[PDB]
């Protein structure tokens, strides 16, 4: 919810892009390094 295309959560018109602001969020195989 700050600006973009997709829906972070608000029904507000400017939301925040789908991949800028994922839900589900990325996976957990990169956070070893």
Known sequence: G??????EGITLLPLCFKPICIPTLPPLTGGHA
């Open 2 to 7: 700050v600006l973009g295309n997709d829906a």
